[model samples]
Target chain A: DQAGITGTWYNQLGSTFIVTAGADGALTGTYESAVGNAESRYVLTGRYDSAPATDGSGTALGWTVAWKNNYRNAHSATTWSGQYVGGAEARINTQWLLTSGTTEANAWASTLVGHDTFTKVKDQAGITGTWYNQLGSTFIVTAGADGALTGTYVTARGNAESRYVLTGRYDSAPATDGSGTALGWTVAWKNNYRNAHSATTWSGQYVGGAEARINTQWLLTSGTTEANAWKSTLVGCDTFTKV
Target chain B: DQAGITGTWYNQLGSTFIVTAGADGALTGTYESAVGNAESRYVLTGRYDSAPATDGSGTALGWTVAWKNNYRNAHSATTWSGQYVGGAEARINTQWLLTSGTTEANAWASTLVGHDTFTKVKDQAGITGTWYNQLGSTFIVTAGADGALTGTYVTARGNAESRYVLTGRYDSAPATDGSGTALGWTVAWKNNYRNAHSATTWSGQYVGGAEARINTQWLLTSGTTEANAWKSTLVGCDTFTKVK
Candidate 1:
């Protein structure tokens, strides 16, 4: 009413005009077809000077189709697209392409590859979530860095598999002894997820560090869990940024 | 100029006004405060008469408002979003989440822990991909399965830092050789990223399956590069999974 900027709502993006508005401060137009069908009724693109009230300068003020739907429609199902186009700052999770006279599929251009450039967006690291297979194999990696795996095998040599080695570089350099003391690995393999299958047959090398004097045992029974022998191989690392 | 319809656009949910409108043949109305600053703007809602275009006597069909814009000077900033509500499904990717109507910190709710779910858009098992790493010392194995480990040790007897031990299990039962085959164990030691440094002295039981003799061999060599010391306590897996 004041700025005198108004227009009609159209459909097909472009033409096939329906209701229209002239320059006067007052609004005016009509229904395209008797039923407002495609042949005659089309959504209108309202054009007005949007730059005036903009920044408060009437001279440098520009004329743009600021906003639409000045008219109100009261119906539960009836709706309007009430559209707009303008400027913004920084890249956020916004559907800019979608909201700017563009199609949903096309709007993905900016969205598909858009990530949280805002450092504050997501700060937590590692995974503490739960996962499961269709077969109901519930697995959870305590931390994003911990890889919990289990499985079995069919072998007479009694090679009871390790519940670790899920994959990739499973690097967890936890120093416990002195400095880089090699706190040693923690694994559980048996009828239960409690402890290792056997310490008797639990033999191995003194890696990054260990006791050559003690931890050298062997099969209390034997590492033989064959048949449905399903052993999981899991591994991981403390992902870090190396200087 | 035609059928009838009307409503208002609120900037902040259920609060002050941004703009308002009504339609009779010529879609029209005045911009209210509900829309906030005009230098920035976004249409939260719009509609038209559900009734037929002409008054039944005219024999016209129902008419609707496909899309329209209300003009104002308040302000217009892209995604200026001081007035957007969820499911407005505006041409913008901004969501209104009317459930708690307002802008989200993560937008798509990527940070609302425990509240979000992992949507497996795609999953194809038995995958193989390139696995790379800046090698460290050694992938140390601390313990083994119960019955699977029988009795093993890496004691240098008196040596303070020996790197080998007899692992695997014991088969009290005969392994066809008349006696019994203990079990097959794994042996490994640390080599710098270049698989360099140290040395290891290993000794253990290799329970041959049924008919073979106890024959296990290991040699030390740099991994993927040139270095000193070549120790072989290595075992290998088939492949990897290239997670998307």
Candidate 2:
């Protein structure tokens, strides 16, 4: 049964969990993520235990997890619990809670930071060099020597009259698409359009060359007058081409 | 089995959901939350279908979901899948995927967000006043007539010399502890210390009077020291007492 959970789990926003199910249902795992401008690559170590399903059906072997942020001076504790959706390698439904210095509590008062499904994930690589999308959004990226990423973007159609430069940074994680072969990539970026500033993000795989694509979002958080006024916007597939 | 998925879900930081599990594994729900300091409540709607276990081992039948952020202004879609941990009126394990304008998909690329168990939730009231904690940290909270919260925090022993000031703001949501008897509380705050400025948060139940407490944390966005060196710190069971 534990074998079902014995892999990696993740999604588009860059949240990931590398898990190993051990004896007595001992859950050992690492959580890695960089949400929004929090911008620091954070990875934490922790444990989980099997919580019982309210019904005797036993179909739901629920589990609870609590982890402390590691390697980053950010000393916060996170906790989560969910039903197994019924599989070792199947997706688990879960909600997340983050507490301050609040570690190892049999019960925790958690802030509902965000909700996500931790699906089984596998290994993926390759996403270096320049890529362009259908909308003319071009990405000139270089995989960092540190396993991190750095790059820039130019407005579509070469709008030299009004330059909009966007930048991105990324780290590797479990693939979200169950692509066992898709690049499990996590990334973030910013749109600098003069007085107005907006935040952007990408999550997906690099199928190789131009075949690679990502899901994108543009958020304008109180960008001050002449600049940001909108709240949030979405983009389906900001496809890219190898330049 | 469908009866097991019907009800409400919530967490302390205020992310709440009202769900309806229909016949044939049709899942519909609403979402709401307030994060960071931008502080505007957000709401959305979504749908989900049952995904069967690969080998009929009943291990993979965990359901997958797809929803879209609704009304107000922001545009985005979300999806997730998880096992039920087997509770008809208990906690349901869940993971979420938020995509840019892309609603429900058979397959999706997800950004790893936090993980959680959505327990059945109920409803409650507002929290407003000055609350105290066991660690000597005191929170001066005020509830706007509009049901929002605003407040601050002081040191463990009421000393002003070595102090940390924290502020709070909140919105409403479904209770997450499976009590279905709580107020879905979502809150956020900012910490102003020497040379560092960070945003922090808490989500909990109003257990009543001195019995009421909230978990707390101080976020440091790569803080630059003026008087302190560490970037962030967390305080579990950062309990608080109420005083006018």
Candidate 3:
């Protein structure tokens, strides 16, 4: 289930990672660990888009993360693209890319930082509760008995407030690498903003235990931006945890 | 000395609070702590605008913050306005107001949510280094031997890139609250966006220690928006850490 990956986790290296899963299946959070050199720590935060297995089995979860990290410098862009293998949702075989910290193509590449397997903390699971965002927004999600998920997204924008109703469907997909079961989910939202946008597309991977991350592309449909506005696609590269 | 209050802080509760002080004196970050109840946490973030002590000391600092928090539900607005007393540079005597999270004149009330004191973590000082924003941007700042500050701000705006050169002056201010040495700084920036605009003013508070946080208001001058786009003041809530 999409809610599977919703809390805190740690790898064998003793590094720390936290996730805050939004009811809208939106992921936003932070993580800090020793990286680069023995004296440096890779402290980073991001949002992401989550989807089911493209492997066709539609039983696994996959995701891409976009975040900025403070390694040698605080201005480096990094990405974590990986899949949550089934049977072992806790073991997320992942890879890190330096994106813009280097040159060539700032996009995802084979240039390896350190590919390690991350294990989830047992207590971090059970994402079906209240959650919070960096902007101090709130998300309350409910899991129906039939694998159906629904929630609300609210944020205080200045003196004015913005709220949305979220709904989605989630299941599992087969691992592409032939591991085990991977979590997959598809979600959308209806908000009072412009009343002109459609449901967002969400995809990503989950541990089905504690800690999950996903990416989403948000479009500001018809409310704020007019002829001189209309800035479509507010991309999300975030992590999530239980309230 | 303005860099003293640039790192992480904590309350009596085991909550995690982080701040990223920019060389240009911009402050932004996030904090999540359980409040009101054990099951509910007030997760809120904010950005502030700092200016020289209108008290004429030019030595101390004054600031206003705008932010929202989710407590009972998932949305509420709050503001923290006060001065960084030069007497107690580290002790910020501020008041919190519930701007509009409720009905019935929720416009900045005198009702208090405990006039709590925030002590800066001694190890969390020094913000004169590199910083990053939500847009995956870069800011490199350098502190001069003469206490002068200079920095660069660059961001990857989708297909385009926005860059800025920052300049500022740093000093200490006299305490308004009868404290000690209150750190103060004033900054301005010139960007590559609107050649029509000159410099933008940045106001904020800081501790000349391990970490810092500043608030700034940005203007999208000489850009699009025929008339409606003229709505100026782009707010920035960012975080930063030291590198070299």
lDDT of 2 by residue, B36-80 (tens): 222233332222223322321111111211121122322222333
lDDT of 2 at A20: 71
For model 1, give the interface RMSD.
21.9
Chain A TM-score, each candidate: 0.15, 0.37, 0.36
| lDDT against the true structure, each candidate | 0.18, 0.34, 0.33
lDDT of 2 at B157: 29
Predicted candidate 3 versus true structure: per-residue lDDT over A1-243, tens digit per residue: 245556666764565566665554354445555443223333332222233323321111122222222323322223343334334454444333222122212221111222334678530134467765444556566644432346665644322246555543322222233221111222223333422222232322222333332222121111112121112122222233343
Error of 2 at A218 (Å): 9.1
lDDT of model 1, residue A184: 14
Residue-wise C-alpha lDDT for candidate 2, range A1-243, written one tens digit per residue: 466667777854556776675544344445665352133334332222233223321212222222212233322333333334343545554433343221112112212233345666631145677677756656766654432334455644321224333222233332243331111121112223332222223333344333444322211111112111111222123546564
For all candidates listed, what's the TM-score of chain B alone? 0.19, 0.35, 0.34
Better of 1 and 3 by lDDT: 3
My TM-score estimates for the predictions, one after another, are: 0.14, 0.32, 0.26
Question: What lDDT score is found at residue B217 in candidate 3?
Answer: 17
Which candidate model has the greater lDDT, 1 or 2? Answer: 2
DockQ for model 1? 0.01
lDDT score, candidate 3, position B160: 32
State what share of the real interface contacts each candidate retains: 0.00, 0.12, 0.00
Model 3, B5-114: lDDT tens digits are 35665544443445564554454445544343223323222222233323322112122222222223212222332323233435432323221122212211111111
